[PDB]
Write a protein that binds this ligand. Structure first.
Ligand SMILES: [Zn+2]
Lengths: 81, 103, 201, 49, 225, 115, 61, 31
RNA sequence: ACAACUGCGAAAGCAUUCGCCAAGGAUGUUUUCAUUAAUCAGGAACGUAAACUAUUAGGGAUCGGACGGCGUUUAUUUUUGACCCGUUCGGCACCUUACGAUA
């Protein structure tokens, strides 16, 4: 307070700032890869999906939508990129 | 327009803190307190009400207040009175009791 | 014809008991004002317990209680202690000639800002109209949120009932206090003991 | 003049680092009559004893 | 001392207790005690036999003197009477009511009560209404003063409440329903099954009202007694 | 011990000491407050309630019930929901002259929404 | 003073007290109770003593 | 009440008896 | 009664349950046309009373999302919810300070 480096905020204070209020704004959502153990299929799901994402066939599920992050279903794997 | 109505409303604090309401707990305590069971309590209440009447007639300063104190007594007295009124305001904000608004 | 004698001297077969429930901000004050309450209720013969875990005041008639109206006195006492009347006044209901009353005034004004204005009008400038009503009616009035809790003799209960309804119905309490002062002045002399006093108000 | 206030030192260190008596306990706390959940735990302990 | 009346109004007083006889009252089956009191009814003769009035009356009696347990100082029950014997008065269930002292003794501020009403019919074709009340549980080791359930959560609680009372009162007869109402099995199961939605401090059934009884059968009415 | 149910309607204008059987249908004996006091001003008074309770307890001990369950009420629709002096004074006199009291309940008509 | 102002015993004892003090020479007037407020004084008694009153009467110097 | 006024008047009568005795004895019975 | 230093609606206002009908707010998104916008002349829809009076700089509460989790209770164990905590948007209101003002 009184003087601070405004071009170099700390990553920890930057990380607790709201989305639109970081120095250059940017998202905080991510993409996941999801397989369901009987299938060798790799569907890529967005973290905050509004669609009941289905794998390439097999009338299953992969996630359900919410007010925030998509709740991935049951036993499923996820790497995140 | 009316006089004795205006006198009954202003002096109600002094009367109800002196002795005049035996169903109120503060007045039922001050009816046996000792400074009202003494010999000339009614005359002393009369002096207080006459001082308030001349104040309502236009006097800026009082006769009953003490004017010189050693600055630690007056700071302790004013701080204790303000803390008492603040604690009553907080314990009336909780319990939902509404109180008289005054700055 | 109106005075009531204290009870001189087992009148209870089924061991009666009453309960009331209070919140936490009252739990603190009740926890450090309770020994006065159980002292006076032991002088009346009724066991009074307090439960900070559930938040409940209980009274129950013991073996050696002899006054049978004491259980009604104690039930009203724990009702007022739950409804945050201060403790010496709640214990002042245990005298013979006192009674409490709760006046629901939220139903009387449709608006909200008009209700807030009329409630503060009932309370008055610096509480002066409220303590003037307490003096003229010999009552204890507590403007309690949406309700008004009054205590005192039954005559004063009736007059503060009339004054609270007329204050909510936009008649001013200063007008009602002037009315009560005129009634007190007329009832002072019994030369005018039975006339229709409407020619003076 | 200058010795320790032992109660105040114990309270300072506390705010820095942060079958024969349990019957007369109930004898002293049945008289209040505040119920006071530590007494509920003491009643369960007395029932187990 | 001085009278007040008009001209020729005081009739000659007749004794009304020559024409009155007492009748002991027995409670139905699932209550612990049977002799519950005594009723002074008029003397039977032609032109309104007194057994019609004895078929008409109902009683209101607490559960403490029935179960001999002062745990139930509240929950006053109501007993119709439809049968008569020699110096006897056989009764049946009609309704179950709280006391308004407990209804004031349950309501606290900064917590939600949820009320639910059902019109359920037992297997003996008695229609009855069950009014359940349920106060919200203040969780220990909490700091926030208000334990408010959301409105959608209240609607889910009321839905589970009416589902439980329908599924556990539609299958039994009236005698088993009273035998389940007495130790409050219904409120216990509502407390057990609603705690995944919002925990409830106490669930009671505050009223039972029998609306219509289409049968007069002395077989089951005496199988009670 | 034959329990009779005593309805005590304690208003501000008159008190009603009323004794019924357990049913509620058959009135055993009632004495109002104003029939014991010459003054309509003092009709609702502790003396009136004491006289009424003494007469009611005398009649019901001549009939031999000697035990009451007491239900106290007041004017409750748009009224006061509090009993007058008649309730306290009548219960005091009633149990002071015999009459082992059983269960006490204040059954006032409380409206869910009146006006 | 603390008695009410229209009281008979207040008026009678005011006249008695003022007449007694003026007869003893402490007060110089008998028509004000503020004389007994702030004019009755141990110096007034001590100047009603004998050597001061004969100093005033010039019996001595 | 009025008993407060009567008690105050009797207190002033008692005070004046004591004070008149003291003042007459201090003026040495010339009064 | 619950019933609030709360919630919703632009305002007056709105409190029993359940069903239907559209609408609205905020949040989240891995959503699109890219100035569409701001303000109000004219105009248009909704409608007995009064009476004492670019930030402030955060903190404590509060509710509506969304995310995270040492854990207690659901839970016969996963959901999920309740409680506690932290981050983040959004909003009714409190106090302190004015950043000042000014009629
Ligand atoms: Zn697949």
């Amino acid at each position: 307070v009184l003087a601070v480096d405004l071009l170099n905020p700390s990553p920890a204070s930057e990380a607790r700032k709201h989305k639109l209020k970081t120095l250059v704004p940017a998202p905080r959502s991510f993409f996941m890869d999801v397989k369901c153990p009987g299938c060798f299929t790799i569907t890529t799901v967005f973290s905050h999906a509004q669609t009941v994402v289905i794998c390439q066939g097999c009338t299953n599920v992969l996630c359900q939508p919410t007010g925030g992050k998509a709740r991935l279903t049951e036993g499923c794997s996820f790497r995140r990129k | 327009n009316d006089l004795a109505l205006q006198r009954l409303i202003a002096e109600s604090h002094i009367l109800s803190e002196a002795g005049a309401n035996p169903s109120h707990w503060q007045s039922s305590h001050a009816a046996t307190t000792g400074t009202n069971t003494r010999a000339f309590a009614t005359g002393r209440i009369a002096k207080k009400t006459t001082d308030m009447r001349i104040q309502a007639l236009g006097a800026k300063e009082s006769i009953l207040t003490q004017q010189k104190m050693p600055m630690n007594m007056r700071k302790g007295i004013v701080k204790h009175q303000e803390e008492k009124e603040k604690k009553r305001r907080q314990e009336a904000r909780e319990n939902g009791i509404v109180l008289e608004r005054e700055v | 014809k109106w005075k009531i004698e204290p009870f001189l001297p087992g009148p209870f077969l089924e061991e009666s008991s009453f309960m009331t429930l209070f919140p936490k901000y009252r739990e603190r004050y009740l926890k450090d004002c309770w020994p006065l309450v159980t002292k006076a209720l032991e002088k009346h013969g009724i066991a009074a317990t307090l439960d900070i875990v559930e938040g409940s005041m209980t009274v129950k008639t013991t073996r050696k209680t002899y006054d049978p109206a004491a259980i009604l006195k104690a039930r009203d006492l724990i009702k007022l202690l739950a409804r945050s009347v201060p403790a010496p006044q709640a214990l002042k209901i245990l005298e013979d000639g006192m009674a409490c009353d709760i006046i629901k005034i939220r139903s009387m004004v449709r608006n909200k800002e008009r209700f807030v204005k009329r409630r503060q009008r009932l309370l008055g400038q610096n509480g002066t109209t409220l303590k003037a009503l307490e003096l003229l009616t010999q009552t204890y009035i507590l403007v309690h949120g949406n309700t008004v809790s009054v205590m005192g003799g039954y005559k004063g209960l009736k007059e503060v009932r009339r004054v609270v309804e007329d204050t909510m119905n936009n008649i001013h309490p200063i007008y009602l206090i002037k009315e009560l002062m005129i009634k007190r002045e007329l009832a002072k002399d019994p030369a005018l003991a039975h006339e229709d006093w409407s020619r003076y108000l | 003049i200058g010795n320790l206030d032992l109660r105040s030192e114990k309270q300072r260190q506390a705010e820095r680092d942060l079958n024969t008596a349990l019957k007369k306990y109930l004898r002293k706390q049945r008289k209040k009559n505040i119920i006071d959940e530590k007494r509920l735990k003491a009643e369960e302990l007395y029932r187990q004893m | 001392r001085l009278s007040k009346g008009k001209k020729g109004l005081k009739k000659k007083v007749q004794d009304p207790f020559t024409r009155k006889d007492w009748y002991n009252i027995k409670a139905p089956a699932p209550f612990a005690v049977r002799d519950v009191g005594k009723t002074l009814v008029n003397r039977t003769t032609g032109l309104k036999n007194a057994n019609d009035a004895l078929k008409g009356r109902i009683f209101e009696v607490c559960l403490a003197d029935l179960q001999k347990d002062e745990d139930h100082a509240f929950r006053k029950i109501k007993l119709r009477v439809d049968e008569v014997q020699g110096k006897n008065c056989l009764t049946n269930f009609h309704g179950l009511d709280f006391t308004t002292d407990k209804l004031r003794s349950l309501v606290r501020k900064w917590q939600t009560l949820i009320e639910a009403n059902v019109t359920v019919t037992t297997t003996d074709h008695y229609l009855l209404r069950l009014f359940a009340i349920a106060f919200t549980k203040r969780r220990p080791n909490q700091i926030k003063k208000t334990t408010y359930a959301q409105s959608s959560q209240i609607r889910a609680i009321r839905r589970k409440m009416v589902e439980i009372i329908q599924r556990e009162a539609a299958s039994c007869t009236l005698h088993q329903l009273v035998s389940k109402l007495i130790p409050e099995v219904i409120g216990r199961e509502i407390e057990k099954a609603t705690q995944g939605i919002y925990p409830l401090q106490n669930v009671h059934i505050r009223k039972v009202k029998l609306l219509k009884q289409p049968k007069f059968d002395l077989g089951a009415l005496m199988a009670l007694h | 011990l034959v329990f009779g149910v005593a309805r005590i309607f304690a208003s501000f204008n008159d008190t009603f000491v009323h004794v019924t059987d357990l049913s509620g249908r058959e009135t055993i004996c009632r004495v109002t407050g104003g029939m014991k006091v010459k003054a309509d001003r003092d009709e609702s008074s502790p003396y009136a309630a004491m006289l009424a309770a003494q007469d009611v307890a005398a009649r019901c001990k001549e009939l031999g019930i000697t035990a009451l369950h007491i239900k106290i009420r007041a004017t409750g629709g748009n009224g006061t929901k509090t009993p007058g002096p008649g309730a306290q004074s009548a219960l005091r006199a009633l149990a002071r002259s015999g009459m082992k009291i059983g269960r006490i309940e204040d059954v006032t008509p409380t409206p869910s929404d009146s006006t | 003073s603390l008695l009410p102002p229209d009281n008979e015993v207040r008026r009678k004892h005011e006249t008695l007290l003022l007449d007694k003090l003026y007869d003893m020479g402490i007060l110089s007037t008998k028509a004000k109770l503020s004389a007994v407020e702030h004019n009755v004084t141990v110096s007034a008694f001590a100047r009603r003593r004998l050597p001061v009153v004969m100093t005033r009467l010039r019996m001595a110097e | 009440a009025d008993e407060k006024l009567r008690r105050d008047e009797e207190e002033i009568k008692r005070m004046w008896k004591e004070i008149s005795a003291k003042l007459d004895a201090l003026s040495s019975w010339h009064y």
